[PDB]
Amino acid sequence: MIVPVRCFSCGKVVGDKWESYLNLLQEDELDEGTALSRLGLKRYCCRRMILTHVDLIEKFLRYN
Amino acid sequence: MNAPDRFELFLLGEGESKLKIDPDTKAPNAVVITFEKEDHTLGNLIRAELLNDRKVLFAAYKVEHPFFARFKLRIQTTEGYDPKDALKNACNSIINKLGALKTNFETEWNLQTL
Amino acid sequence: EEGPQVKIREASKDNVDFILSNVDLAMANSLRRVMIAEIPTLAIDSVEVETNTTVLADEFIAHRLGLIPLQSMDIEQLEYSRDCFCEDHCDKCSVVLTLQAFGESESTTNVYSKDLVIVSNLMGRNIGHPIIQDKEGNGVLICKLRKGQELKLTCVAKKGIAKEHAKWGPAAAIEFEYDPWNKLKHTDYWYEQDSAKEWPQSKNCEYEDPPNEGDPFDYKAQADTFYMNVESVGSIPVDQVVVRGIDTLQKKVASILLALTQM
Amino acid sequence: SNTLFDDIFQVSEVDPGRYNKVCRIEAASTTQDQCKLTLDINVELFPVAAQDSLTVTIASSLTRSWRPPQAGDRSLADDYDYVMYGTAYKFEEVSKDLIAVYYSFGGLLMRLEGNYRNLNNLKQENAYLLIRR
Amino acid sequence: YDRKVPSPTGEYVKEPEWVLETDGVNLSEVMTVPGIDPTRIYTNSFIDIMEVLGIEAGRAALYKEVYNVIASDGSYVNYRHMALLVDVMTTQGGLTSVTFEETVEILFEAGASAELDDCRGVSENVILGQMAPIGTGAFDVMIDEESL
Amino acid sequence: KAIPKDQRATTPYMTKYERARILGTRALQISMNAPVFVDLEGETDPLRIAMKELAEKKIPLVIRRYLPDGSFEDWSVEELIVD
Amino acid sequence: TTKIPQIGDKFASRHGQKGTIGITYRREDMPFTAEGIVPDLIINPHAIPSRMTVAHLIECLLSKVAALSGNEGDASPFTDITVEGISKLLREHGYQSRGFEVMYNGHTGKKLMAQIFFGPTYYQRLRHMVDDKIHARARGPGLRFGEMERDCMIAHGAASFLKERLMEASDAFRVHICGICGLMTVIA
Amino acid sequence: DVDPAKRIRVSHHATTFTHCEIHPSMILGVAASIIPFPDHNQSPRNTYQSAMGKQAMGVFLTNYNVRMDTMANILYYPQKPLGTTRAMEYLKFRELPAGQNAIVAIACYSGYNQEDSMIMNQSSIDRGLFRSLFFRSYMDQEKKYG
Amino acid sequence: ALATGNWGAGVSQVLNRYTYSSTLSHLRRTNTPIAK
Amino acid sequence: DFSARTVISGDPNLELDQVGVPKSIAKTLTYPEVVTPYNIDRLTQLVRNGPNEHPGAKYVIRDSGDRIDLRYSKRAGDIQLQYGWKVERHIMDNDPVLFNRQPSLHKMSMMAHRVKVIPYSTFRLNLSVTSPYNADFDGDEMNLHVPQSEETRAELSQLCAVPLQIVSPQSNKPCMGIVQDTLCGIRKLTLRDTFIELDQVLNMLYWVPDWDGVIPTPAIIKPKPLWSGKQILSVAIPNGIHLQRFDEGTTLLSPKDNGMLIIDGQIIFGVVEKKTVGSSNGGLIHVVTREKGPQVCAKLFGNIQKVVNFWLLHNGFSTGIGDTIADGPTMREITETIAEAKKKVLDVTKEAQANLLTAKHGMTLRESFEDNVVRFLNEARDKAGRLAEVNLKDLNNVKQMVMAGSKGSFINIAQMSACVGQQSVEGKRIAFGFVDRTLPHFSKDDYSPESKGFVENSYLRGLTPQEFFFHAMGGREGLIDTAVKTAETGYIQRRLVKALEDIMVHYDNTTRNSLGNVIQFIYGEDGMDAAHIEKQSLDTIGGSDAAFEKRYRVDLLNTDHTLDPSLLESGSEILGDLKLQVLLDEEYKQLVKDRKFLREVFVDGEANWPLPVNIRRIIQNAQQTFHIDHTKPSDLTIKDIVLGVKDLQENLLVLRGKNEIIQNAQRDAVTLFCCLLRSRLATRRVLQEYRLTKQAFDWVLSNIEAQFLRSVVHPGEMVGVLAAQSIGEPATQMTLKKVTSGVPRLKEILNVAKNMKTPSLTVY
Ligand SMILES: Nc1ncnc2c1ncn2[C@@H]1O[C@H](COP(=O)(O)OP(=O)(O)OP(=O)(O)O)[C@@H](O)[C@H]1O
Ligand SMILES: [Mn+2]
Ligand SMILES: [Mn+2]
Ligand SMILES: [Zn+2]
Ligand SMILES: [Zn+2]
């Protein structure tokens, strides 16, 4: 619904990287993989976390 | 639910001990100790040292079911040599080589930048 | 200093790559495990919810609060709540943190873990503080509000071990390798046409001599040298994941000598 | 307490077929027209090549636990490179008016054809096997 | 087809033979055709076997139809289970197929026929509060006054 | 309608069903504080006790076997061979 | 309620094979890659060759590349996506190219003789779980014993059981009975 | 000179075409449009997936908090599949997914995953893997025809 | 008739909402009452 | 009532006969246990714990019939039990309970297990009980039933308990074996090259719970102490167990490590796979059951599992996409394989197109054409798949499963890696459901492979759209056929059981209905229990006349054809003795008749037939047990043998009546077993082959006789139900030529249908 706090599998914090990841794509124009590796998410387990997040809360916030 | 609390993996119920030591019937100068609220971390380590001891005739451990944090270690030794003595000898070495290693490390880390 | 030998090759606030040298696989593996499972650490483990008009449910939020890593350098000097003589919690067994947020702005207001206020007496032990490692010093995103929405909470942290719930774990991944060439033949490589074309060379191979095709297999060799790399989440600095890691084992094994003595 | 056959062999052939650590020597006796060895060996612990040659002794000691080296730090009823320990399962292939005794070393197998040690080769297990290069 | 037959020296050998196989069945009449072996003619219609060759030959056809079915899938069941079945099907002398308050209908008939219920079934025994004379119930147990 | 002790034609071996029923009738009795005939060389478990009983041949019971035609033979526990 | 996964809950890939969780292991105890990656889930090889679900295996290869490279991996049917191509790309990225990795046993740290096909695959949590599914009716004041269960008990010969189970608790009434006219006419 | 790893196709022996397919993957329905590589599966299995998908938990609508239905399952942390189909775009499966990308090993390891069973990572669970919300609504009417 | 399925009956059913694509699927179902 | 139902899971750490029951379920179900001085203390404690702490209790009932409710009861902490009260206690470790997976189609779907109380919420089971219950761990649930009295507990443990159902009557072999992992791995463990080192050895050894504590001696001493995989498994196979088996050219030096040979409980040669340790006619679990009994056999499946899954946990095993890729060169050969078959097809086509093809005899031209193209295309699929099999290596993990026996077969290799092949709907190639075509992407009158459903591609490679759709047509037909099978089968099964349910064996050995009618004058025509019957070869039947006379003829009056004097002590002294010769002529005449008789019974010459008392394995035991030297003459005499074997025949009793009729029955019942007997213990075999001593010989006999007597069926068995369930239950795994077959046939049989679908006469 919202970035998860850590990689389910390794524990790395990943919940402090979502705003940046998204800034890194739309503001500095990197392809998703280059952007991930810039946030230091280099094992495929963490990469999967950000790359396949879906921020549903952004929809949930539209209701009154 | 029917899930046993997680604390049960490291913390002794009422009435339980760290060790129970029992004589083994099968062969001489043998013992079986059951360790509670422990698992492989200890169990493979005590074990593997017991085997660096040449008065150690047998050593082996197992966790009989993965649901319970308990292991069972069987030491057999040469005539005259108490197995509980072989397990002080072996827990002793352990502590000593680690001793060692936290020092070799605390060192190597001020030799260090970043 | 004779015995098990160390050899850091990199270090960083966050990771420490090293090489253990002159030790058994078991003690190596054991230290790996301890670092993963049994180093004490501090983590939200109770959450009272005064108000949540958020779009997330409470246990969803709670769960997320248990996961925010909290400073833990001085955690030996916090007693486990279950050893303390207080009724429930207090300042010897617990930090208490507050969280209030209100979606004041029109646009969407984020709640981050810097918005966590400690509310209890620390006795100047360095614990409790939300850890912060992003450029903006937000740390972790906890929630999001809309204009009109509210969330007020208290939390209690408590000392704990990842065995009991991973939130309490300090370490994150732990690289661990040995014998990169395969000399020990501890593994047997799968392949279609050629084993060496088809498997990638470990970085750890440089550090070690390739074998020579003549050399008949060495039955006596053992596993003596290990390539590790411990990565910290941050509640505990790294060197300290190891040192407390070695130290926790050493206490495990001493509780075993103490209880032969009591037999 | 004894030893019980002992001779020197010529290696015809070394088949590994399908295995990696293990291979099947076909050897001859230098001496007898009659006495042969087909035998399975751990080639990683003890390599072996075509035409190499072998001093081979069955023996029968120097059934209680097994206890590590230590007795083994002086006490070697071996001056050899290579020692196995098996079990005879025999079939006394008593074929032609030559013998064949069979032997299994945790499943690494042997067979001796020949004749002169019929009143020699244990009916029985306790049987070691020993090789120098 | 190949047919295992003993050879002049005693051992079994293959000896092919032609065989005819038909769609449709006229056993009584085809049996009688010159040149065939009437002693080895077969059909998968066990009814016709029983009509021409009798109850026993039908029983043994029927088994062999049952056994074919079960082996054609490739499984194996011991003889005696299929033998039991096929006996149950043929013991009256022909081929018999095996395929608060209700029921009253049936009890009225019982009445009027003077039905004698042997009381060996498990339901009847339930209604009566008893064990059925099967397995562990097929004997009685009594106190051994004759012993020291 | 009864069949003299000689001339009895049924197996001299105990069947699995008789054995099961004996042991269990007897354990039912031992479980209701019925006197026991054998040395409890520790046992507390009534089935187990009963089986000790059956092995020492101290179960005084008789198996009445009906034949399909109404007629019956009586075989004692003592006498039945247990295999 | 929040439902946290448990022994007993059901899960599936998208290739028409489910399972239940038969136990959980904390991460220490799981096998690991030299990079210290550990599995979230471990499925048994015996579940594969008969069902011939090669698309599972291909999804896992493709999915490893996708994660490593940050692209969405094209799994549609009827294209020119190939394993060979997938495998190439994954080799470019440093892994052996059929998706095997060396792993190490958790309990010991020793390497594993065999290497292990390891990769992300998309799994679904399916509804309908050990808590909805467990009951246990033995009174105080399926799940039955029907025709077929009786028949098995007859087969084993268990008459006493069959009487106990199929009784009434409807008490045994007693009754006198003439031995000439079997009826319950007897004045007692 | 064709690619040894491509499938065999049997060429246009046709100069009379009147039409052409838009895309062959459009023969499939909604459910089977979510299976990756169905053309590499034995056919009954794609049939069994096409049922199970209907039991998976995801986010059925963005408005769940405001509905009140008999029963509902929302997964904490839906992830979109690393392996998708081009049909999914229309089915919005990336936006309202029903699944998570799990790191999976295929291995014999302890014997507790035999006979269509699985070992799952407890630590992974602790940190949220496959956790979901369940909601039950109960209703009741009042008085009636008395 | 909308509340029942009373028509030909199973003609009207409650819309599945387990998951987004189970919904779409239900809306796109067909049924045949009653030689291959 | 007194029962629970949940989800099942497997567990390698439970014994075959256990079931794990969650603690919550164990505090819900209860057993009424009577206070006595043997249990008043335990019952007391269980009362004080009460309903909600397990080992506890929910009610106490006194003298009165008064029911004391421990959860409410203001006196629940203060009960002083009396002898003769009752306590309803929670179930607890080792109570017997009955466990059942529905549908219960045969009796081993309801077996008694020993409780083990465990945490979490699933009922748990040993992997090897799975197959009788027909259960797996993807959802399946099963029901557990608690017996309520002492007699009922005895019935369940002394007749329905799992150990007693290892060997079943259905097929006179085991119905439980080693499966899945432990089967993949026992083979791996047992290869030539698998050696283990001391650290891992001792942990494997301590893993077997009743290892005597002796470390065995290593098969390698020399550069290094290394033990074999063989030896370590052997620790779990008990002493005095012998088994041998020859595979396609196994010898006693198995180049390939084929077959199997095991002596005194130690593996000598052979890799262990499904033929040895599976649920197989004459493998280890069938041997161990009989030689040492049910309880040890049931331990054995856990000691083998403990060992082997330990080893496999540290060895590892996996499978992956790689295991389905065959070589570039293999692929080209597969693709040509396939191209040639499409050219065969193309000629047969042109040939029918020119009107040159002939049908033969009531078979249409087009039927001929199709029969030929489908042979072609199947023959291609198959060659292509043999191709791929061959090319994969021993370390190919798909292959390693197939070789073990644990999962998968050739067709699976083939279709994954080489080619899926011709799809079919109702026995035929995909039909023209558009007018003269199978899909609109093709032109009309196209009978080619592709047009009619040949799928050339493998799964790895992927299907084309047209293939894809024809394979779904295919597939759908088996989904349908499957539901029709399951439903047809279930109705059959119930009707057979209702038909046969009252048939029982009686204490006259007769099998009868509830009327007392006779169905069979003796059960099974032989009076045996099918559980005690094994496939044995009847020796007299086969072979040439010369060969039978070398092996059995003893001619004491002929210096070439007597018993050499090294066979027997008396050997010198019997040469030319006339009156021994008279006995021996008599034994031969009976061997001769035997062979004639049997060749009339078995017209075919089939020598291997189920009979009770595995004589070869008794003799093999005698040989082990008396340490028998092949190198010394025996002290048996001619008369000892010849008359000893005649006397044993008289005591192989099935029927015991004093009249002539029952005697004839008895003799007829025991004829075939007596032929196998006289063939196996004939004089020259006893001396020249077996080399028995007098003492071993006398042991052989008295055992034959005890075992024979223990195979007889027991009166009271409900063989009806059994028959029916034995025939029905395997008619349920008919999930699957041009004669009506399989289930519809079998409907056609039991129904006695006037109007059968394919009636046929076979005329020789
Ligand atoms: N051990 C096995 N050996 C041979 N085939 C198997 C085996 N296990 C599963 N199958 C095959 O898998 C198919 C169905 O798979 P599935 O996983 O749905 O079985 P299942 O677990 O019994 O299904 P369910 O429990 O929902 O009834 C069957 O047609 C069967 O042939
Ligand atoms: Mn299944
Ligand atoms: Mn199932
Ligand atoms: Zn990660
Ligand atoms: Zn406190």
Side-chain angles (χ1 to χ4, degrees), chain C residues 101-115:
Chain C
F102 189 89
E104 198 86 72
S105 60
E106 254 288 330
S107 62
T108 277
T109 315
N110 285 172
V111 192
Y112 296 85
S113 61
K114 75 180 208 206
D115 307 336

Side-chain angles (χ1 to χ4, degrees), chain J residues 140-177:
Chain J
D140 296 33
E141 302 173 270
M142 296 191 198
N143 300 340
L144 166 154
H145 306 265
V146 179
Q148 272 332 256
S149 64
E150 225 32 90
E151 308 96 293
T152 271
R153 277 167 116 264
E155 262 173 14
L156 287 208
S157 51
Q158 307 304 112
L159 279 2
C160 326
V162 170
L164 311 166
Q165 306 297 317
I166 292 162
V167 168
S168 103
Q170 186 166 294
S171 275
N172 59 90
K173 65 167 226 210
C175 66
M176 301 176 235

